[PDB]
Structures are given as structure tokens and as C-alpha cells.
Write a protein that binds this DNA or RNA. Structure first.
Lengths: 68, 419, 78, 420
DNA sequence: ATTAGGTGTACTTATCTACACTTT
DNA sequence: AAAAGTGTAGATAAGTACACCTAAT
């Protein structure tokens, strides 16, 4: 639902949805993606983070992005 | 020489067997090649699945017990002919794929209801109705379940439940308690209930690769593969030590290990969701005393987007039975003895999986603490109990808490252990 | 010319190619997107940068990226 | 009351005009509404384009000169009826869209070749064969079909692939040829232009990029285009930033197309960064070349489903050559319309106004002004034989060209340090 | 009580504005 | 003689981690 062209905030909101869709708390979700919980919160809130941090979570949750 | 592959009532491809070259070939329809998913990761859609991988995958669908010998003897074929065995069991197998010989179906379809009188006579004398240590044994049957009467499903309709009987003491009670505990703990696990036949008790397990559509005659299947078919392993590799417990063979592990199990996370839809499910599966089996957890006890749904872990099934505490050899079928840091597991084994284990130790402690601590209040809950989910059975659960209860308190003691040391 | 999924490196290479596709130098692309030339070099090489920085160039060059749907399990499973 | 909208040989929609309410309505077919692109950004595919915006878009396709008065006299209609005027020119307009009354086509199609003598009589006697005080623009011209050898007028689905322009005012042809070629030599994106000779009289043949001649048979493929006016949803009257006049009472009224308003369209372009650069170079080129007549209808965009893209430049002429006209920039730089009053401050506050880094301006400005001196020499050789006055004209052209470059090049380095 | 959240030092790291250089 | 890609260096300043600190329902 709501689909998206992707921006920084919706991407963060997308991660929260995939995380919640998988029934995962932020602390366990953070550890498997190789980041701190606070950093994962920053990502979900769309707060500025390193591109590498986002890719760790992207690769981790098995979510793929492509150029339209 | 050619068996068609059917998904439900629909034909998704063809399984070819060349008798002369003793070879298997699986090629798929074109519509399925783009939009579909392969039998296993090792039998791709382009038809590049090796004959060996196909063969092992088919063999992985057959029974390992006397039922195997009952099937080959009923048809009167050799152990070495798999082709005849598949085509026979083709309509109903694990997963959503039914293997159909070309142009042959009853169907018709209908049903065969069951009476309590025929099962009780089929309970008491195993000879009439076709020793060191442990695998199984155990009795079981696959059946159609409407909520009231059990029946044999025929044709396109298939058994939606597996009813399991206890020849050995309190096997039904053991698995029911443990399976229920997982569900009560919030784990993802197939739904199980106890059912009564005469004086004898049975365990009715709901199949998640089958869904009964109410209101008419059909049974909808969802495809699944075990960790063996996924890793492309022979049926022999179900245990991490693929030969035996022997001291000369103790050092041979070609089978499924935890590192090999977790490796499948990458192919799953959600690698993170699986890896916790993987570890919870490990940690749960440690706390409940399940040493029999092996490759065919953990399975995945097959979809075009990727694999997904199934709900857990066949969860049993073997520590209850001391007439059996109990070693973890999947080791923790090269330590197979459940009683020799300490902070170090766990620390080096997670390190082996390349996962943070703080995560084990989190999951281990959370589950082990919630068990004491959760075990009491399961006891209430039990049907009427006799005195001997109440004594069993008492022993069950006691040593369950013993595993929890034992692990809960040294768990704090895992963080600081230097390997 | 072919990237099915995007990763950190291919993304950088994607930016560099569209920049070249518009016959646009690295100095002008950086300024118009509101970043330094050095950073755009870092972006194109896939070296780690701030997500906002990637987005500055992204919206600027008019390249849109989207996830994949589904409806996971393609509105299926039985 | 209803004109069908045709793209090439295909029908993409319907233009409805209600006579009573004096109103326009544009609705689209279902296949096109999903898969296509609108006439303009202000006339969306769902058919929600307001009647007023539609009217202005059509008016923006009509001539502003005596050709208008010749057209209305030929049809014998009122100035206030646009529908009849569009319906007359409906088959051939700017862009790929031809507006066709239902069930009416010539085609037939063929061609009508031309002899040089009938063109010269239309050059030599504008009164028999078609006082301005002080103005800027516009030239006489005709639209024609070009096969590479002989010229003809294309009829029906066949259309003019080139614009042939005639010189009433001194050396206009030489002016635009030099400037259009100079831009191309500098590597800018600009339409291909050639000189053609009629008798003793010379003309400028410009290649249409919204039209493509397919060799080998009879067809012409069109690609749709819109002006910056049609894109901004501005009236034809707003083509100049000051939409009324130079009058001191009106000096402070700018409702028209500005540079900041032009650059705002970059977001709508397929590649905003690539667009903004073409725009700024267009400004910087027009400043260095002395083009003060560059306005809203002289800058256009291709229309595609993915977005707009800037077209190659066209109609680049240096008006600073002609002092018989009062010249103010049709698009201001930091609220300064005078080309001679432009200094480091105006440019700085201009880029600041565009919210763009100043270092970007100096790069383009510096590079172009230095590459010009060597570039002018190149273009001069691409000319045919010239008489004495024309060589003196171009000699004058060249000298002050370098003077503008050298002039700007003086204070440009100070642009960085100016505090607004 | 378990979850989403906020810290707070301290580690490591990017963006900025030039000048300088390795390549046509 | 460029002219694009690619550097470096100091002041800025921002995100990440970590054991664990702590409110938020």
C-alpha cells in the first residue's frame, strides 16, 4: 500500500514496515544487520546516515531496489 | 520414461527418467520459467538440474522406516528403483507438486471415512497390520481432517493432517507439550492437538503444506522443501555426522550443520527473519532437550521471490528417554554432547555463525525465563491424565526447569569469554 | 549498461553514466547538485557517503529508484 | 465545435470548443491518457486542463506579425475567434500535433515545387507581394520543405522541414548565421542552419528539429514541442519578462517569463541538472553574443511521457549590432534589464537568486569568452563570398564580440568575493 | 515488563573550500 | 594550451558505537 518513488524518509519507513512485517524488534533487527539499535532508529526515522548503513539493512532484510 | 509435474490440478513441468543411462532430467514449461519457482534450489528452471541432485531430491521425499519396505514389497520392486516409488506416491507428497504419469487419474475423487473400530484393531498388533540406540521407530498416518471424522483422501484431494501414535511411553504427550510450549512461547509452529482412540492416545498435527478449502472437494497445497533438498544433500546427510556415532567416524561431518543451516538465510526472502528463527530453533531445542533436531525437521516454503522458513514441527524432548543415545544432531562449536555445552561452546558457536553474542544471550535469556510460567500453561492444555502420565509430566517439568536454570547460570559468561 | 539490482558500487556507476549520458562534467554536476567535486567522485566510486548526499544527486539528475512488489508471495501461498 | 487532436497519422484525443460560453475543453483517449503525454504540462491527460490555459496554449501557436492579419483576411474572420484560426493552421503547427476537423482530409498529398523567380518577387516588393519607429523583432520568413536540392511547399500530412528567413534589415542573415554557427562550433546544442541564395538576395535556411524528413518515400515524422510560455502556462503577451512595456509607469511590472521562472522548469525536465546547464549557457551565450531579444517563445522543450527536455537553441542573433533599436534584456539579471549595466554584482545576486553556486557561472562564463576568439575565426570561413559592406559588418561584428568577452572577462573573478 | 525511544563519551568518518596533479 | 579526472589538507561537523545509561506505554 501507498507504493513509493523512494526518498530518505519513505525508505526509512519502508525498513520499519519490512521489519514489522517480519515481527522483529529494533534491537534484534539491528544486530543481524550489523548496526546499533539507535542507528537503526535513525535509518527508520530517515535521519541522515551513511549509505553503507542503509545497505547493510537492505541486504539484510532482502529488499531490492532498481532504477525505473 | 516421462512423468509430468503437476502443481495442484495444473501441470508445471515434466520429470524425465532415462532407464538406460540411469539418469534423471527435469525440464520446465516456459510460462513457469519466468513467473514460477524451481522444485528446489538445486533443480533450476532452465533444466540444468543435475541428474544426481534430482535423484537425491526425489529420494528425500520417501520414508526411511518399515513403511519404505512396505511400499517396495507392496509394489514388489527393488530398493534401487525410485521411479516406481515416486509415481506411486506421486499424487500426495511433501509440498505442492504432484507427480502424475501421463494421462492417468481416477480421480474420482470423493472420500473414505474411518471408524474407531478399525484403528483400535490396528493399534494393538503391529505384526498383523503391516538393538542399540535411537532414531525412530514411532508409528504415524497421514489423514484427511474435517474437524470431526478422519478419512482417506483420494485423487486430487490429499491428507491435511498427520496423526501420530505412541508405541513408546508418552511420545504423544512429549511432543504435544513441547510443540504447544513453542506456540505458547509465541514461536512459529504447526498446530497440534491430542485425539483419543479407545484407551490409546494419538497426536494430530496440522499440515502447513496443505490447506483444506471448506465447502467443496479440493485440498490446496503449498510447496515446501527440507534443509537437505535445499542444500542439495543426500537423505543420508540429515544428521551432521552422516555415518554414525562411531569413534573412528566421530570426526567425519559431511552432513547438515548449524553453519550450513544458517547459510540458507541468504536465499530466503528475509535473511534476518530466518536467522533469528534459525537461532530460536537452536536455542529452543537446547532448552527443551531435543537432540534429534536434524535436516528433515526444518523446512522452507518455495516461492518465486525466495525461500521462507516453515513453522517448526516434530519438536520432542529426547532427554526424557534415557534408553536412547542423546547427542545434538547439529553440534555447537564442534561439541555434540548436550551436557558439555557451556559459555565457551555458545560463544564460539555464534562467532562461528558470525553473529553477535549479545543476540544469543538476549534470545536465550528471554525464552528460558518465560518457560517456567509457560510450562504451567501447557499443562492445562492437556486432556485427562492418569497417575503414571502425571508422573511423566512431573519429571518432564522438573528437568525442563533444570535445563533452563543450568543455561541461565553461566549465560552471563558468554559475553566475556575469549576464544 | 546492465544492473538488475543496485548495490553501492553500481549505483555510483549509474550516476557516473547518466552524468556522461548528458555530456556533463564532474565539476558542474557536483555544483548543480549542491556538493563538492570530491564527494561526487566518492559517490561514483561507491565509497561510503551520507544518504542525503546520494539523494541530492539523485533528485538532481532526475533518476528514480523503487523497491519491488508484489504483494510478496505474489498474492499467493496456499 | 470539436476538433480531433492528431499525432502524426494517429488520433490522440479531442479538442472541444463550446461557442456559447466562449470556452475550450481538452479531453484525451483512454490509451493515450495512460500511455501518453499532454499537449503541455498545464493541459493534463485526465482532461482537467482549465479552459483558459487551453486557450492560451493555442494562441501561443499563432503568428504575431502581418501574417496574422493576412491569415484573418484570407479567412475573413474576427481577431477574437481562435478556433477558426487554429482550424485553418490545424494540420501544421509547432510540434507533432495536428488539429483536424472530424472526417476531413485532403490529403492528397504530393508536392508543389518552387522557382526562384516567385520568391524574389516576394522579396523585392513586400507591399505588392507580401514605419515601425522603435521596436525589437520580427523578421519576414516562410516555412518550406527541404530535400537537399530543390525547395517545394509540402501539403497535407507532408510538412515544412525547414524555415527560410528573408532579410529586410541590414545583414540580419549574416548576423544569425554567424551566431547560430558560433554556438554550434562552441559545442552548444543548436539547430543546424544554412545560407541559401535567391537572385542577388540571401536567406537563412534553418532546420526544424520538431520535424524529421524520412527519405525514400512520402512521410514526415514529427516530435512535439512547446515554448517556455506554453510550459509555464503563460499568455503569449507574457513572452517578455515585462509583460506590458518599457514604460516608466510599467517599468516595475514584471509578470512575464524571468530566468528564475525559466529555471523552475528544470524540475519538470527529464534531467534537471542537464537542463539547468543548457539554460544558464543560453543566458551566458546571449549575454556574450549581445542578444537582448531572447524571450519566452525563443526557448522550447520537447514533450515526452517521461518529462520535458530542453531543445537545441534556435533564433540566436546579436541585436547589439543594431543600435537603431533600444535594447533591454528580455530576461533580467538581478532586476537589471540593461546589458551595459551588468557587472560582478548583478551576476552574483543572479546566481544567488537562482539558488545556484557562483563558481558554476564563472566556469561557463570564463570558458566561453576565451574559446570565442578562436571560434569566431572558424565560423567566418564557413561563409560564402561577401561584398565589402558585409565584410566590414562582420569585421565590426567580430571586434565588439571580443570586446564583450574581454569586458566580462575583466570583473568576473571578483564575482566570488562580492557580498550581497 | 518488554518495546520504542534517548542518551553520553569516545571511535571513526564525511563535507567543505583550495591548490595541486595525473591524464588528453 | 588546455581540460577532465583525480588528488591533498585543515577546519568543520556529522554519524556510529558501546556498555549501558536511562522515559515511553
Amino acid at each position: 500500500i501507498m507504493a513509493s518513488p523512494l526518498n530518505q524518509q519513505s525508505l526509512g519507513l519502508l525498513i520499519k514496515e519490512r521489519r514489522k512485517s517480519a515481527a522483529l524488534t529494533q534491537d534484534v533487527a539491528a544486530m543481524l544487520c550489523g548496526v546499533t539499535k539507535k542507528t537503526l532508529i535513525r535509518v527508520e526515522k530517515g535521519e541522515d546516515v551513511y549509505i553503507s548503513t542503509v545497505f547493510k539493512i537492505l541486504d539484510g532484510l532482502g529488499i531490492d531496489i532498481v532504477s525505473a | 520414461l516421462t512423468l509430468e509435474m503437476h502443481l495442484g490440478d495444473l501441470m508445471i513441468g515434466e520429470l524425465s527418467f532415462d532407464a538406460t543411462a540411469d539418469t534423471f532430467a527435469v525440464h520446465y514449461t516456459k510460462d513457469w520459467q519466468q513467473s514460477g519457482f524451481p522444485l528446489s534450489p538445486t533443480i533450476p528452471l532452465d533444466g540444468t538440474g543435475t541428474s544426481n541432485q534430482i535423484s537425491m531430491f526425489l529420494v528425500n521425499l520417501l520414508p526411511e522406516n518399515k513403511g519404505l519396505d512396505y511400499l517396495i514389497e507392496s509394489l514388489g520392486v527393488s530398493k534401487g528403483n525410485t521411479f516406481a516409488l515416486i509415481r506411486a506416491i506421486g499424487l500426495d507428497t511433501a509440498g505442492a507438486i504432484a507427480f502424475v504419469p501421463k494421462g492417468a487419474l481416477l480421480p474420482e475423487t470423493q472420500l473414505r471415512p474411518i471408524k474407531a473400530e478399525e484403528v483400535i484393531q490396528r493399534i494393538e498388533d503391529p505384526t498383523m497390520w503391516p538393538r542399540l540406540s535411537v532414531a525412530g521407530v514411532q508409528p504415524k498416518l497421514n489423514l484427511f481432517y474435517n474437524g470431526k471424522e478422519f478419512a482417506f483422501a483420494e485423487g486430487t484431494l490429499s491428507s491435511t493432517h498427520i496423526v501420530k501414535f505412541e508405541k513408546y511411553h508418552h511420545l504423544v504427550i512429549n511432543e504435544f507439550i513441547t510443540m504447544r510450549l513453542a506456540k505458547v512461547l509465541g514461536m512459529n509452529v504447526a498446530n497440534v492437538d491430542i485425539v483419543h482412540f479407545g484407551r490409546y492416545k494419538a497426536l494430530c498435527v496440522e499440515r502447513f503444506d496443505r490447506r483444506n478449502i471448506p465447502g467443496e472437494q479440493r485440498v490446496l497445497r503449498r510447496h515446501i522443501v527440507d534443509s537437505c533438498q535445499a542444500l542439495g544433500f543426500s537423505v543420508s546427510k540429515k544428521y551432521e555426522r552422516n555415518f554414525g556415532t562411531g569413534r573412528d567416524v566421530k570426526d567425519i561431518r559431511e552432513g547438515v550443520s548449524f553453519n550450513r543451516l544458517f547459510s540458507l538465510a541468504a536465499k530466503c526472502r528475509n535473511p534476518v527473519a530466518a536467522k533469528q528463527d534459525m537461532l530460536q530453533w537452536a536455542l529452543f531445542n537446547l532448552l527443551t532437550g531435543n537432540a534429534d533436531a536434524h535436516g528433515k525437521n526444518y523446512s522452507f516454503f518455495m516461492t518465486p521471490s525466495g525461500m521462507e522458513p516453515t513453522p517448526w514441527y516434530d519438536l520432542v524432548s529426547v532427554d526424557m528417554y534415557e534408553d536412547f543415545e542423546q547427542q545434538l544432531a547439529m553440534a555447537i562449536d564442534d561439541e555434540f554432547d548436550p551436557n558439555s555445552i557451556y559459555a565457551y561452546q555458545l560463544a564460539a558457536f555464534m562467532d562461528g555463525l558470525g553473529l553477535p553474542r549479545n543476540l544469543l544471550i538476549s534470545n536465550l535469556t528471554r525464552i528460558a525465563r518465560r518457560i517456567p510460567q509457560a510450562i504451567a500453561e501447557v499443562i492445562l492444555m492437556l486432556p485427562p491424565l492418569d497417575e503414571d502420565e502425571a508422573s511423566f509430566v512431573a519429571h518432564y517439568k522438573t528437568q525442563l526447569l533444570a535445563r533452563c536454570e543450568r543455561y541461565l547460570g553461566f549465560v552471563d559468561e558468554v559475553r566475556d569469554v575469549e576464544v
